[PDB]
Amino acid sequence: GSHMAVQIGFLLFPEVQQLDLTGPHDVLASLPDVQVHLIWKEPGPVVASSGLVLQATTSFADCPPLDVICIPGGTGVGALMEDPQALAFIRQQAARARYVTSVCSGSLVLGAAGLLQGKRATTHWAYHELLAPLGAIPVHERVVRDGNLLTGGGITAGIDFALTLAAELFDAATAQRVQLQLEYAPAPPFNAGSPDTAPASVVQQARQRAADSLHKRREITLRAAARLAAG
Amino acid sequence: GSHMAVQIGFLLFPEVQQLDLTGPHDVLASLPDVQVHLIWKEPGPVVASSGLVLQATTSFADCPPLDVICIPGGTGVGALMEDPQALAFIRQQAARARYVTSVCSGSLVLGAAGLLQGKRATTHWAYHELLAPLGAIPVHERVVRDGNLLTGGGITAGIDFALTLAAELFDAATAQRVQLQLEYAPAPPFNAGSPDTAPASVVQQARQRAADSLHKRREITLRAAARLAAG
């Protein structure tokens, strides 16, 4: 309107881990004058990994130049990593976006798009070995920042970095106001959010359950890397 | 199937604060054998306060007996507090549910349904004075438990209590596994999630911005209380 509207965009794709996206969405959608997009090849229903149905609000072609782009993760990321249209849109938008961001395995899509080369980055802990092949410097921190790239490992990392983005786009007082108004005050009743804090028996379970997925994602990653190499 | 399916149900209503619901949804939907419902007067699109579109999966009438019911908050709660159909469904389900829960201003709906009488409970901090008129013992804690009632003040409190519910429905090892697999490891870059930690200037801003809403919600609350009194 008669203020500058910040254009904020989430990639919304089948089998997305919905909370990756919906967390930062509610935070950023609180900010003054912003316009938030859920972006897919076409507008309309997209099913998340839980069966939860979201609605994409815009196609790739109709998406305005974004100020913030965010790629969430989820099972659906493996397909996205070899999706030439999606990767081309992500590259297009990343060229000029003020902020390029991802949650969870969303960073592996950034990697497949060629956007992690020589960058410090993280991803979901079970898939961390897939960073180096995509040219990233792999870093084990909840949110890793490299210039205007922010990558968050865990499911709610986007809620946290959304507050950082709020403070920079606007001011610290604005970010603090949003945190208070939403009353965002996390206090988990367990301490098993990191493979370095969870019980060993639990870490081994989770490694065992992710094994087939990691195997499949590694094969995809190596194909994505070879495409980038051929350059 | 050939295991017992826990029936988990979120009230999904127009102008819901979506993250209230989508947080605990992704956590609980991770649990073994569970079936998760988004419940409204009819299945189909429901617009959240941000403009984000969700899909209700079931009507009141078709909703199975729930093991967990969760009422989220958001601007839409004021209408819900005087919605005789919605209140009757919430009472019906609460009678036998193992767990009755809410996030944010969702507890004021529980209160309007007559379910907070003599119970310790919390709600969104800006509306906390509305607890006593609905018969609750108001408590300032992130998640307040009274028997099988859990009420959470802030936007992600349901993510946290979802882990508690996981541990009780199944076991601590299961809850820890879910936390690790999702990599839920919150670390906000500000400390303004409570009116006792945020800067005073920020707390006064937020109080000023919520004033009209609180005024309107108080009027609604007092009508809801008088209905309960007439008994």
Per CB-CB distance under 8 Å, the chain A contacts of B45 are 55
Which of B18, B20, B58, B156 is the mutation pick for testing A, counting most A CBs within 10 A? Answer: B156
Tokens at residue A5, please? 């509207």
The string over A89-127, giving b where at least 16 C-beta atoms fall within 10 Å of a residue's C-beta and e elsewhere, is: bbebbbeebebbbbbbbbbbbbbbbbbbeebbbbbbbbb
The H or E element spanning position B176 is helix B172-182
> The dihedral of CA A89, A94, A99, A104: what is its sign?
positive
Query: Count of A–B CB contacts within 8 Å?
Result: 217
- Check residue B34 and report its DSSP letter: -
Whether A185 and B194 have beta carbons less than 8 Å apart is answered as yes
C-alpha B50/C-alpha B133 separation (Å) is 29
Amino acid in position A194: S
According to the 3-state scheme, what is the secondary structure of A176-228? HHHHHHHCCCCCCCCCCCCCCCCCHHHHHHHHHHCHHHHHHHHHHHHHHHHHH
| Nearest CA among A27, A71, A25, A75 for reference residue A50 | A75
Nearest-neighbour CA in chain A from B69: distance (Å): 17
Tell me, rounded to whole angstroms, the distance of Cα B12 from its chain centroid. Answer: 10
Angle at A132 between CA A15 and CA A223, to 5 degrees: 60
| Nearest CA among B14, B11, B4 for reference residue B25 | B11
Tokens at residue A229, please? 């190499």
Of the partner residues A26, A53, A176, the one whose CB lies closest to the CB of residue B18 = A26
- Check residue B76 and report its DSSP letter: T
Could you tell me the CA-to-CA distances from B154 to A149, A183, B47, B147, B225 in Å, in that order? Answer: 29, 5, 21, 20, 23
Tokens at residue A39, please? 């972006």
Count CA atoms within 13 Å of residue A9 on its CB side: 25
Per CB-CB distance under 8 Å, the chain B contacts of A196 are none
Whether A71 and A11 have beta carbons less than 8 Å apart is answered as yes
Residue B227: exposed, middle, or buried by beta-carbon count in 10 A (0-12, 13-18, 19+)? middle
Tokens at residue A88, please? 């081309």
A63 is catalytic: no
End-to-end alpha carbon distance in chain B: 42
Would you put residue A66 in left (φ > 0), alpha (ψ -120 to 50) or beta? Answer: beta
C-alpha B184/C-alpha B174 separation (Å) is 14
Main-chain dihedrals φ then ψ at residue B195, nearest 5 degrees: -65, -15
Three-state DSSP class for residue B43: coil
Asked if B186 and A160 come within 8 Å (Cβ–Cβ), the reply is yes
| Nearest CA among A185, A103, A217 for reference residue B158 | A185
| Nearest CA among B156, B126, B56 for reference residue A26 | B156
- The strand pairing partners of B71, in sequence order, are B102
Tokens at residue A77, please? 């990321």
Q: Å resolution of this model?
A: 1.9
Which of A56, A104, A113, A136 is the catalytic position?
A104
Tokens at residue A135, please? 């040219």
Nearest-neighbour CA in chain B from A40: distance (Å): 15
Tokens at residue A49, please? 């990994």
Could you tell me the CA-to-CA distances from A92 to A88, A96, A115, B16 in Å, in that order? Answer: 6, 8, 11, 34
C-alpha B192/C-alpha B203 separation (Å) is 9
Would you put residue B217 in left (φ > 0), alpha (ψ -120 to 50) or beta? Answer: alpha
End-to-end alpha carbon distance in chain A: 42
Tokens at residue B146, please? 């009274």
Q: Quickly list DSSP for B91-156.
A: HHHHHH-SEEEEETTHHHHHHHTT--TT-EE---GGGGGGSGGGT-EE--SSEEEETTEEEE-STT
The string over B7-45, giving b where at least 16 C-beta atoms fall within 10 Å of a residue's C-beta and e elsewhere, is: bbbbbbbebbbbbbbbbbbbbbbbbeebebbbbbbebee
Contacts for A200 with CB less than 8 Å, ≥ 6 apart? none
C-alpha B100/C-alpha B66 separation (Å) is 9
| Nearest CA among A3, A23, A182, A89 for reference residue B74 | A182
Of the partner residues B53, B104, B184, the one whose CB lies closest to the CB of residue A193 = B184
Question: How is chain B split among helix, strand and coil, in percent rounded to 5?
Answer: 40, 20, 40
C-alpha A18/C-alpha A76 separation (Å) is 11
C-alpha A14/C-alpha A75 separation (Å) is 9
Radius of gyration of chain A (CA): 17
Asked if A186 and B159 come within 8 Å (Cβ–Cβ), the reply is yes
Of the partner residues B52, B164, B188, the one whose CB lies closest to the CB of residue A25 = B52
Ordered by start, the domain boundaries in chain B are 1-231
Its CATH architecture, for the domain B1-231, is 3-Layer(aba) Sandwich (3.40)
